């Protein structure tokens, strides 16, 4: 039986056996009132003590969500969709520490993807206790709004400012300054760790001037904040408030009249009608995003990167070789996951137009131009290639190099990693290699539980990139020091050094993608 | 061991197995198979190549220095053999180049810059392919010692190749 | 000392830690412990550096000694706190009979119980910590002695004798390795003949007597002394090296053993320093130029002599690696001591 008193009151957890070992477990610890009533759309509020033992032993609601629908009974989507309740009450987190006890221990913020529309922090892909017992280090994640419910925007209006879901990490981030050292851990020692959106998020936490002394370091998996996808125009953003009022028969205009409509409408209705609220979305679209909202975020955040006005530290920023693959089976045409998806010319163009959607015709002939000029035989999955390659390369990993770049150009030392292995267990088939989000497992050590089908090579670099990730955090540099290990060069724009992961051996090789991201870095804005 | 490293003391034969049985690791059964081509390979050709050009360039003059990666689709030895010895010359004769031959495609392409290189390199001292947006070669220099990787795929600029296994054949083994 | 020291005339803000030894490897650890940091200035390690590699203990093994340990004082149990509430009723004298059993072989070298990383004074690995920089930023002087490994010697390997001028043969030397180096695989004691054996020249009937002194002195003190000193350095902070090279006129071990471990120490405090007491005048004068050196890096974090026209001590770099010789006769700038065995015993033997 064991009980630890936070600031707001007495917590109860669970032991946990892991590798002949133990964890203390602290799942779904409130961290702000409830976001009910007349508080839908406003930033989270701070909680009211209770006098009680809060019973901290199961995971907590998910945020309210859309769910990926599109492949019932299938492992490969579903392993995605939210595995607790759904639920506006959902402002909760969870603590993984070792045992025994800990010191004065570095700390892992976990921050989910989802585009900022889905995610949650109870997958058994981002179950901690692995990374607790291994590391001896203390593991955080919670759950924040996402969709309208968490980045509606009339900006300027408290009633639905934007960037609500921000804001919830922020308060979680404060509740770990507040209290984690009551738990055995450092709050001078913590790092932010997120994948996609979470990745973006981490990303603007290094600009937003209140999280600023709320962590030490980040680290960046498959996302920044300057992808195409990440930040929604104050334009687009009321626009879409507004149609999201039409929609629901909620169209007023003291827009005060329109919020307080949209808060007498239930989830299910708001949930329903977000999908509508641009008129071509792609299997990219975030209908609901961050803004600029002159409190998050003081200004464009392009801006912001060009002129060195974000927190200085280090960071730690990565890709996986295959990130665009996943989004071609969710509506670009003869693709599938049930069959090897040889497209043609036509196909190619159509695809095109599906990821593009309005992209002028010159825009969508240099994507082409850029990427079919084949080296060569012809080859004839060349053009389901050049599109998994396309979509990946303006989404994640050009925006990511860039990111990487500017930010270690004001003299912070950088470390990027370019992530190259399939799970033997991937679900989706081979054609669509090492895809967006199948780092994470490796991230997480879940090849470390031997019960668990994955090879003795893929234990290895589970053991590796754990380490690794562990030393950045306590130390602010990857290295694995011990087994004889190819050394992790940081990043300098000029050298652009990276870091191969794979399972066979691991290369030190310089300006990933470089003829790819010219095109997307220089070319494409202008279109 | 015995077959290729004949006399040669007990301790130096142990020297290369423990060098190269170092399992990364699953077991794998074809290890023991690859370890042994690599001693062979790395013994006699590939580290004294690399030590050649080293202990040249650092008398001032350039250096190219490339890893020849591509099996021949026409190789009649089989798969477990790779890239052998002996099997870049028909490329750097432009075999390739003859259509009626059996090559494919990206094999005639392949060849034909190696050629263009190799020429380069005769006329102007500079294995450059100047006009199909080709990867450039960098000069080998002890420091950096980048090379450049020839296959029908991507052409990699990379650095120090083999470097764990020559300093264990160009520094330790020649005193057993 | 922090909370007292001013009352005795001390200043808390001006403390150098110095050590032999394992004291040695105590001074470097407190540079690796954070609750350390604040309690002093400056640190000075004789013969010894955590990373040697009889100073810290694996967790594993630690577990299996107090395991034994138990086992030896009919004190085994398992509600673990039982165990050592039975190890607390049991008197010193059990408790230290028992000690030396807890290892199925041990050496001349062996640390039965020694640090571990608790958690608490250790967080992690020390040598990870060396290896990304995470200690005390501040100067260091670190040294070590001509013959570190022959105090040894007379503590087990065969055919050694401190009443004789210890020949030993070839087979002699290879047992000599089974005594220091328990297991160790057939191949790892090859390696160590072969670095150590190859002569210049002539047999030369004390070769094989010098070779053992020299692979228990390098293994063991001079290359982790080394190792710690540029890894430290590395990171930015002056660093100063000497190399021990005077015998004491008094030194009642024979002359075989040559300027052993420990028998700096004596210079350092002084001793020579009384003429009441038999040391040579120029050992007065090399004890009385080393205090100096000693004190002026605890003053003011640099080890010179300034008024006697002494050699300048140039500070330790990775890349030039210059240290400076301590003798009755000239002293010495020098580079990359001992540089092809500790490539031997740092890049290749921790390997095997
Ligand atoms: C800014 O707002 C209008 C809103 O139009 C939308 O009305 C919503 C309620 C929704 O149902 C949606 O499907 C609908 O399109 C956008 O103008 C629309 O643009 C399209 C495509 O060109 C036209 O064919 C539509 O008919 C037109 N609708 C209306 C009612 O005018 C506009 O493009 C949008 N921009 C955004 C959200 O980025
Ligand atoms: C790979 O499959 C796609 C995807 O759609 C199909 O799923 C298949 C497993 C198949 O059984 C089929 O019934 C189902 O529609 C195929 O794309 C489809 O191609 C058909 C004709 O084959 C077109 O007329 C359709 O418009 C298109 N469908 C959709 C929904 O986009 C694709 O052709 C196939 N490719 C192969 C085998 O290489
Ligand atoms: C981890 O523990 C065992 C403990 O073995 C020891 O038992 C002690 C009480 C002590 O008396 C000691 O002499 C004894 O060896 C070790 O296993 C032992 O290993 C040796 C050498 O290979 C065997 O021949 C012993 O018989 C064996 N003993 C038993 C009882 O199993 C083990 O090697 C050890 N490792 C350490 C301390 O580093
Ligand atoms: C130097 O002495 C050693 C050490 O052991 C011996 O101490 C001597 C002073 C001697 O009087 C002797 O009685 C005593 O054992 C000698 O090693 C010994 O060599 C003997 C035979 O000479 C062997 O049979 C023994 O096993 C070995 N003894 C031990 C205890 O290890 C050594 O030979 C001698 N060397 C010289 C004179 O060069
Ligand atoms: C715990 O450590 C505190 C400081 O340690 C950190 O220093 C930061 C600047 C950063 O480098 C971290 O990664 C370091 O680990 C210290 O001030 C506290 O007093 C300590 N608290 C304890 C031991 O309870
Ligand atoms: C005694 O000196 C104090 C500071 O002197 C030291 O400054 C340290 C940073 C370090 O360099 C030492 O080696 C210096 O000697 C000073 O602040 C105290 O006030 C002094 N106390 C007295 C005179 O009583
Ligand atoms: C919380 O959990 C434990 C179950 O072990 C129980 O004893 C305690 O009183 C519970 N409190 C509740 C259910 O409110
Ligand atoms: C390195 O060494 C061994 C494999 O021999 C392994 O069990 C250990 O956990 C490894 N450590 C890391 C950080 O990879
Ligand atoms: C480069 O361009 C074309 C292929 O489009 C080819 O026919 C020509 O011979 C090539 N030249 C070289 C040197 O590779
Ligand atoms: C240096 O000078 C004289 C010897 O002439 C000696 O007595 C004095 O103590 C010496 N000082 C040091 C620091 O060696
Ligand atoms: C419209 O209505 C509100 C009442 O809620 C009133 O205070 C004001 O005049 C208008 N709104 C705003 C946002 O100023
Ligand atoms: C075994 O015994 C102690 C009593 O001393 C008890 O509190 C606990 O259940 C067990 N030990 C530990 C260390 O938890
Ligand atoms: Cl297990
Ligand atoms: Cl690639
Ligand atoms: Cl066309
Ligand atoms: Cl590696
Ligand atoms: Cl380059
Ligand atoms: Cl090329
Ligand atoms: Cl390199
Ligand atoms: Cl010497
Ligand atoms: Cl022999
Ligand atoms: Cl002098
Ligand atoms: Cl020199
Ligand atoms: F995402
Ligand atoms: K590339
Ligand atoms: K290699
Ligand atoms: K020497």
């Excluded at 309740?85 to 913020?109: F, G, H, M, Q, R």
């Excluded at 932010?192 to 960046?220: N, Q």
């Excluded at 870091?499 to 300006?511: A, F, G, Q, Y």
Aim: proline share 6%; glycine share 8%; charged share 20%.
């Amino acid at each position: 039986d064991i009980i630890i008193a936070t600031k707001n009151g007495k917590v109860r957890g669970m032991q946990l056996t892991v590798f002949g070992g133990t964890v203390t477990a602290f799942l779904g610890i409130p961290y702000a009132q409830p976001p009910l009533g007349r508080l839908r759309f406003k930033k989270p509020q701070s909680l009211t003590k209770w006098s009680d033992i809060w019973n901290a032993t199961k995971y907590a609601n998910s945020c309210c969500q859309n769910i990926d629908q599109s492949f019932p009974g299938f492992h490969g989507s579903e392993m995605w969709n939210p595995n607790t309740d759904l639920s506006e009450d959902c402002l909760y987190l969870n603590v993984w520490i070792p045992a025994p006890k800990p010191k004065n221990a570095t700390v892992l913020i976990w921050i989910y993807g989802g585009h900022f529309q889905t995610g949650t922090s109870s997958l058994h892909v981002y179950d901690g206790k692995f990374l607790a017992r291994v590391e001896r280090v203390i593991v955080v994640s919670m759950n924040y709004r996402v969709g309208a419910l968490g980045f509606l925007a009339l900006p300027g209006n408290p009633e639905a400012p934007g960037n609500m879901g921000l804001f919830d990490q922020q308060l979680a981030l404060q509740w770990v300054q507040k209290n984690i050292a009551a738990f055995g851990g450092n709050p001078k020692s913590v790092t932010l760790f997120g994948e996609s959106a979470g990745a973006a998020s981490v990303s603007l936490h290094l600009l937003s001037p209140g999280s600023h002394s709320l962590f030490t370091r980040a680290i960046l998996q498959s996302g920044s904040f300057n992808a195409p996808w990440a930040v929604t125009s104050l334009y687009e953003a009321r626009n879409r408030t507004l149609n999201l009022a039409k929609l629901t028969g909620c169209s007023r205009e003291n827009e005060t009249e329109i919020i307080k409509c949209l808060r007498n409408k239930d989830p299910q209705e708001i949930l329903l009608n977000e999908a509508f609220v641009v008129p071509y979305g792609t299997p990219l679209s975030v209908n609901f995003g961050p803004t600029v909202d002159g409190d998050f975020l003081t200004d464009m955040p392009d801006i912001l990167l060009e002129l060195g006005q974000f927190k200085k530290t280090q960071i730690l920023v990565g890709v996986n070789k295959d990130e665009g693959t996943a989004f071609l089976v969710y509506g670009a045409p003869g693709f599938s996951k049930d069959n090897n998806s040889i497209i043609t010319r036509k196909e190619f163009q159509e695809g095109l137009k599906i990821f593009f959607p309005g992209v002028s015709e010159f825009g969508k002939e240099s994507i082409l131009f850029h990427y079919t000029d084949w080296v060569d035989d012809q080859r004839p999955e060349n053009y389901r290639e050049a599109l998994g390659d396309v979509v990946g390369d303006y989404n994640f990993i050009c925006p990511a190099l860039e990111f990487t770049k500017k930010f270690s150009e004001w003299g912070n030392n950088a470390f990027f990693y370019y992530f190259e292995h399939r799970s033997s267990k991937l679900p989706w088939p081979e054609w669509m290699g090492v895809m967006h989000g199948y780092e994470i497992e490796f991230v997480f050590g879940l090849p470390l539980e031997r019960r668990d089908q994955y090879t003795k090579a893929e234990e290895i670099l589970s053991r590796s990139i754990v380490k690794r990730w562990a030393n950045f955090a306590k130390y602010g540099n990857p290295q694995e020091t011990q087994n004889q290990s190819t050394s992790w060069p940081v990043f300098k724009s000029t050298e652009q050094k990276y870091l191969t992961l794979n399972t066979e051996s691991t290369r030190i090789m310089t300006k990933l993608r470089a003829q790819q991201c010219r095109f997307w870095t220089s070319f494409f804005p202008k279109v």
